[PDB]
Design a protein around this ligand. Sequence first.
Ligand SMILES: Cc1cc(F)cc(C)c1Oc1ccc(C(C)(C)O)cc1-c1cn(C)c(=O)c2cc(-c3cnc(-c4ccccc4)[nH]3)oc12
Ligand SMILES: Cc1cc(F)cc(C)c1Oc1ccc(C(C)(C)O)cc1-c1cn(C)c(=O)c2cc(-c3cnc(-c4ccccc4)[nH]3)oc12
Ligand SMILES: Cc1cc(F)cc(C)c1Oc1ccc(C(C)(C)O)cc1-c1cn(C)c(=O)c2cc(-c3cnc(-c4ccccc4)[nH]3)oc12
Ligand SMILES: Cc1cc(F)cc(C)c1Oc1ccc(C(C)(C)O)cc1-c1cn(C)c(=O)c2cc(-c3cnc(-c4ccccc4)[nH]3)oc12
Ligand code: NA
Ligand code: NA
Lengths: 109, 110, 109, 109
Amino acid sequence: LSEQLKHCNGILKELLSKKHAAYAWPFYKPVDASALGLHDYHDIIKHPMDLSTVKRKMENRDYRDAQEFAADVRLMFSNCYKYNPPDHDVVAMARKLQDVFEFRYAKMP
Amino acid sequence: KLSEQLKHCNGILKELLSKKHAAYAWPFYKPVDASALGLHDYHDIIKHPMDLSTVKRKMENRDYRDAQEFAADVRLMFSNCYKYNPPDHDVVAMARKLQDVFEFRYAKMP
Amino acid sequence: LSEQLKHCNGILKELLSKKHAAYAWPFYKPVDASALGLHDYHDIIKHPMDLSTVKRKMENRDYRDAQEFAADVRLMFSNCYKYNPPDHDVVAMARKLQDVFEFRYAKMP
Amino acid sequence: LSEQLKHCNGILKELLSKKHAAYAWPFYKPVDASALGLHDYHDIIKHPMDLSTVKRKMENRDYRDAQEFAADVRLMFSNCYKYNPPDHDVVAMARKLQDVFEFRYAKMP
Ligand SMILES: Cc1cc(F)cc(C)c1Oc1ccc(C(C)(C)O)cc1-c1cn(C)c(=O)c2cc(-c3cnc(-c4ccccc4)[nH]3)oc12
Ligand SMILES: Cc1cc(F)cc(C)c1Oc1ccc(C(C)(C)O)cc1-c1cn(C)c(=O)c2cc(-c3cnc(-c4ccccc4)[nH]3)oc12
Ligand SMILES: Cc1cc(F)cc(C)c1Oc1ccc(C(C)(C)O)cc1-c1cn(C)c(=O)c2cc(-c3cnc(-c4ccccc4)[nH]3)oc12
Ligand SMILES: Cc1cc(F)cc(C)c1Oc1ccc(C(C)(C)O)cc1-c1cn(C)c(=O)c2cc(-c3cnc(-c4ccccc4)[nH]3)oc12
Ligand code: NA
Ligand code: NA
């Protein structure tokens, strides 16, 4: 449904909005593993995902339905939990942004 | 009878049911008692109720095809809670704390 | 071959280099159809491609071989030719950058 | 590259190296002011600068001498000090990276 993907577009705009910027910013663009010297990042994370990639896929009309959109957003969070120790700042930030995502996604008509 | 991935999923379920998480897991142990709570619209809004006892029985019955089906049921349980409730309800805060345990352990699956 | 994709990474770095910026810049990021007022862009171009997308796919190890890399770079140029009239400045820039790409790609060991 | 610009290239490689990544990463690419909701960033900062811009200029042989290189690196730090309050994490990181830069630059033959 166009209606479902319109709601998904609204969720993405919320995740990218200034009120969430203090915990969303690590997810705005791909993790720059090369720049950070994370030589194992692409060994451990086979399918990187970030909000810019989700936005481009939405603009390109690449999502068949809301479930495909949700799978990419959850992949982004799962990658973060998979790669990082539980006490890293970025894990606390992922959890805060995921709470926003899961709540808005659950309210989809 | 359980695959390596579904054995890890069984370990996650045992953790979600364990005493250390009881202070925020207990609302998810059994079905939402809509009658007792006076929730006359609960089953109008939530078409597919799910709780940890349902997931446990499906695991014991070997009803899960793979880890993704397990994760879908656990996320359905949390999504039902977010769908029905306002964001400031105590049960939503509890759902978020338990979901953080689930998502972290699920992501670390060999 | 790792060797082939290493050469492809060298080609991408050349396409992104300052010496080609005068004709490469329209290809650095996805076409901003909203900003340009291009209401039909995503109706006509079903599979957008740009050098930032190619770079992310390379870093993610999404390319199986040099041929898959070349197919995405040629898709980027083909989208530009498909959407635009032959006298548009962006078509002249696409041709100049494609000459750099085709020449370097042909010289691959 | 001249002898002095070869030393400047060695400084750039050090600033981009893994040992400094914990405080260098905010300077790797242009500040994404739009993504962070910093609506006034380009009103306050007239000449953005970052290590990727310096690296592209160095690769293109655009620096006339070591002083032009030093001016761009100091502009990057000055932009950070100009825009930010003194207690922001990014200001502490700028100071740590600038200490590496100033020390190595001073030792240039
Ligand atoms: C969010 C965050 C806070 C912080 F204080 C330091 C870092 C490095 C940090 O994470 C990032 C900062 C910048 C970027 C850019 C913009 C360069 O792409 C990415 C991250 C980052 C994002 N995500 C989603 C991660 O999962 C992740 C992991 C790491 C990381 C960096 N260093 C480690 C690390 C190093 C040694 C041992 C174990 C982990 N892990 O950095 C990020
Ligand atoms: C955890 C919790 C704390 C609290 F202070 C009040 C309630 C109702 C609460 O949640 C439950 C308490 C008991 C039970 C029993 C054991 C009787 O089944 C269930 C819940 C409960 C669990 N789940 C998973 C829910 O999604 C949910 C929703 C509600 C609920 C009750 N009232 C509301 C509500 C109030 C105002 C506006 C909208 C919804 N929502 O209660 C539960
Ligand atoms: C390069 C260039 C020169 C120019 F004079 C005018 C434009 C629009 C132009 O192209 C772009 C300028 C900016 C951007 C941004 C940065 C906003 O994303 C994109 C383009 C651009 C890139 N690509 C790859 C294109 O294929 C394309 C097509 C168009 C375009 C805009 N208007 C037309 C057009 C006009 C009349 C009839 C048919 C098409 N075509 O703009 C771009
Ligand atoms: C380094 C750092 C730590 C942190 F906890 C939060 C932020 C926002 C941060 O800075 C950045 C994080 C990500 C990025 C990306 C990769 C998105 O481009 C950039 C910065 C960042 C880099 N530089 C060089 C800055 O000067 C700057 C300033 C800010 C910033 C964000 N918010 C403020 C601010 C807040 C209140 C009053 C004034 C300024 N300043 O963020 C950056
Ligand atoms: Na060919
Ligand atoms: Na900006």
